[PDB]
Swiss-Prot record:
Top-level taxon of the source organism: Eukaryota
Full protein segment contained here: 188 to 249 of 249
Summary of subunit composition and partner proteins: Homodimer. Component of the HBO1 complex composed of KAT7/HBO1, MEAF6, ING4 or ING5, and one scaffold subunit: complexes containing BRPF scaffold (BRPF1, BRD1/BRPF2 or BRPF3) direct KAT7/HBO1 specificity towards H3K14ac, while complexes containing JADE scaffold (JADE1, JADE2 and JADE3) mediate acetylation of histone H4. Interacts with H3K4me3 and to a lesser extent with H3K4me2, the interaction augments KAT7/HBO1 acetylation activity on H3 tails. Interacts with EP300, RELA and TP53; these interactions may be indirect. Interacts with EGLN1. Interacts with BCL2A1.
Function: Component of HBO1 complexes, which specifically mediate acetylation of histone H3 at 'Lys-14' (H3K14ac), and have reduced activity toward histone H4. Through chromatin acetylation it may function in DNA replication. May inhibit tumor progression by modulating the transcriptional output of signaling pathways which regulate cell proliferation. Can suppress brain tumor angiogenesis through transcriptional repression of RELA/NFKB3 target genes when complexed with RELA. May also specifically suppress loss of contact inhibition elicited by activated oncogenes such as MYC.
Site (Histone H3K4me3 binding): Y12, M23, D27, W35
PTM note: Citrullination by PADI4 within the nuclear localization signal disrupts the interaction with p53 and increases susceptibility to degradation.
Designated name of the protein: Inhibitor of growth protein 4
Signal peptide limits: none
Annotated residues for binding of Zn(2+) 1: C13, C15, H37, C40
Zinc finger (PHD-type) boundaries: 10-59
């Protein structure tokens, strides 16, 4: 029993729920969502030490 309330806006992914499987997050420190599931992009694996969500990456579709 701990039930915190400090985040006035909990959950953020396209799944709107956290603490399930593994996690990522768009490396943009101004991302309005911050974290994303390894299946909110269908990653299944670690991409690199730099990633972007399917909205941050859409701004530079260059392959
Ligand atoms: Zn998700
Ligand atoms: Zn993002």
């Amino acid at each position: 029993m701990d039930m915190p309330v400090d985040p006035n806006e909990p959950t953020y992914c396209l799944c709107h729920q956290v603490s399930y499987g593994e996690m990522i997050g768009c490396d943009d420190p101004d991302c309005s969502i911050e974290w994303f599931h390894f299946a909110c992009v269908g990653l299944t694996t670690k991409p690199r030490g730099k990633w972007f969500c399917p909205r941050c990456s859409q701004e530079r579709k260059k392959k």
